[PDB]
Amino acid sequence: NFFGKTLAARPVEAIPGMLEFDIPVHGDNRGWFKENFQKEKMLPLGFPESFFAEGKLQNNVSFSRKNVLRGLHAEPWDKYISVADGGKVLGTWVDLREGETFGNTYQTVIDASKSIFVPRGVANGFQVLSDFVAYSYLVNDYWALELKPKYAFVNYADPSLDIKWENLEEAEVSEADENHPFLKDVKPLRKEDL
Amino acid sequence: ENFFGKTLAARPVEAIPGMLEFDIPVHGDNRGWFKENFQKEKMLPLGFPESFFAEGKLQNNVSFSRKNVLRGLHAEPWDKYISVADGGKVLGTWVDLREGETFGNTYQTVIDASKSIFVPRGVANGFQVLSDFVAYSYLVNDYWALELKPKYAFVNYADPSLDIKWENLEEAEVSEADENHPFLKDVKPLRKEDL
Numbered sequence: 540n541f542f543g544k545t546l547a548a549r550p551v552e553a554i555p556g557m558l559e560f561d562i563p564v565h566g567d568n569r570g571w572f573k574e575n576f577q578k579e580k581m582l583p584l585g586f587p588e589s590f591f592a593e594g595k596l597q598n599n600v601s602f603s604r605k606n607v608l609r610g611l612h613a614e615p616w617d618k619y620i621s622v623a624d625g626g627k628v629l630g631t632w633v634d635l636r637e638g639e640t641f642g643n644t645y646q647t648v649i650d651a652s653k654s655i656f657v658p659r660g661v662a663n664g665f666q667v668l669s670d671f672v673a674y675s676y677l678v679n680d681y682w683a684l685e686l687k688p689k690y691a692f693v694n695y696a697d698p699s700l701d702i703k704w705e706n707l708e709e710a711e712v713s714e715a716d717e718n719h720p721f722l723k724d725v726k727p728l729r730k731e732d733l
Numbered sequence: 734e735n736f737f738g739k740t741l742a743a744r745p746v747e748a749i750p751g752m753l754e755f756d757i758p759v760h761g762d763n764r765g766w767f768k769e770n771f772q773k774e775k776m777l778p779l780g781f782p783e784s785f786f787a788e789g790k791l792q793n794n795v796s797f798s799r800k801n802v803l804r805g806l807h808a809e810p811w812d813k814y815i816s817v818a819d820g821g822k823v824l825g826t827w828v829d830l831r832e833g834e835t836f837g838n839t840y841q842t843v844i845d846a847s848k849s850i851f852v853p854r855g856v857a858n859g860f861q862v863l864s865d866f867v868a869y870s871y872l873v874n875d876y877w878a879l880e881l882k883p884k885y886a887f888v889n890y891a892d893p894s895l896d897i898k899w900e901n902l903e904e905a906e907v908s909e910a911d912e913n914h915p916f917l918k919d920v921k922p923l924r925k926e927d928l
């Protein structure tokens with residue numbers, strides 16, 4: 540149940556537009572190999588062609604140790620997330636879009652044999668379960684620190700959120716993540732905000 | 734032992750036309766680190782070729798390899814942007830297999846998470862793992878198929894005519910395919926024209 544999975548997608552019913560993928564990982568002598576993202580194979584499974592249409596592309600990589608927790612971040616771009624090494628995280632999502640699904644959540648364990656498409660407006664987070672993990676993701680717009688005040692965030696430790704972190708009490712978080720607003724102070728995102 | 738806080742920069746490799754080496758800004762904090770491994774808008778102006786994206790094709794492959802694995806040398810019928818995604822380190826090795834004045838020209842460099850490389854189509858690519866393990870992530874601009882294997886060119890990592898040095902050959906872990914690739918003398922240079 541890590542190697543040799545069939546490429547396949549499942550909708551995440553709580554969060555419209557989100558897709559969870561099984562990625563084939565091929566193992567041998569040396570280690571392993573995957574096609575982490577393959578546009579031609581993934582469009583027919585539901586990966587949105589609208590992802591690449593502005594022609595923008597950026598690939599970010601974080602490397603985190605045990606109990607690090609990063610989130611929850613809902614910037615105005617789409618994300619394709621996966622793990623790039625032998626590590627594992629608890630992936631956590633909260634929908635911050637205006638409407639009936641505001642505050643809807645989903646959680647799942649992500650290793651290199653799973654990926655997630657996260658629509659713009661859905662807050663993304665994770666906590667590391669392994670000793671360390673390489674988290675790699677593709678995005679279709681460009682971040683700027685000076686612009687950070689305009690993106691949406693919600694505080695990881697708000698107890699009204701319908702999530703359970705692996706280890707909240709011992710989480711290693713950034714100063715920024717300690718200070719994001721609680722859910723009751725987040726304005727839901729309209730298509731106009733993305 | 735310079736890893737953090739490099740300014741984003743690119744350098745051509747003179748011996749292999751089209752090749753570019755990038756310094757990638759890696760930001761550390763209490764949690765580990767973060768990088769923008771690839772960023773089109775910032776990297777086009779530094780030399781990352783616009784042609785990479787022209788067909789609208791994209792595939793991202795990741796290999797995970799243990800210490801002493803040596804993979805190569807493979808020249809594929811597509812361009813490649815290579816980097817390391819974890820804490821590991823490789824010795825990267827390239828041999829130009831393109832027909833012309835630079836056929837057989839080589840370059841090597843250590844790659845960790847703070848360096849990436851643009852490898853043009855027709856340039857053979859390989860690496861040897863220096864750390865205990867490594868996550869090797871790359872971007873390519875055409876889609877892999879079993880039926881495309883006859884379009885690759887290969888050269889043997891051990892060919893003594895190659896102006897290259899590996900770290901540990903005694904202990905190198907090489908695939909049967911890679912052990913048996915032809916020597917440079919027996920490689921037919923790749924014509925751009927048809928390939």
Ligand SMILES: Cc1cn([C@H]2C[C@H](O)[C@@H](COP(=O)(O)OP(=O)(O)O[C@H]3O[C@H](CO)[C@@H](O)[C@H](O)[C@H]3O)O2)c(=O)[nH]c1=O
Pocket residue numbers: 599600601609610612614663664674682683713715760767768769
């Ligand atoms: C998002 C981003 C960040 N940075 C820089 C700013 C900081 O010095 C360093 C870390 O930024 P932070 O905003 O604390 O990163 P982090 O909490 O990991 O959050 C980012 O990365 C997460 C993955 O690690 C994603 O799941 C989030 O969407 C994204 O915002 O990287 C960039 O240079 N470029 C970026 O695109």
Ligand SMILES: Cc1cn([C@H]2C[C@H](O)[C@@H](COP(=O)(O)OP(=O)(O)O[C@H]3O[C@H](CO)[C@@H](O)[C@H](O)[C@H]3O)O2)c(=O)[nH]c1=O
Pocket residue numbers: 565572573574794796804805807809858859869877908
């Ligand atoms: C390149 C590629 C490979 N595969 C499958 C075929 C094999 O079952 C497995 C590994 O293929 P091999 O050719 O033995 O792996 P390897 O010697 O590492 O070579 C590939 O992976 C290397 C990175 O490890 C690249 O540097 C090479 O350019 C690439 O050809 O992955 C795919 O399904 N898709 C691919 O795109």
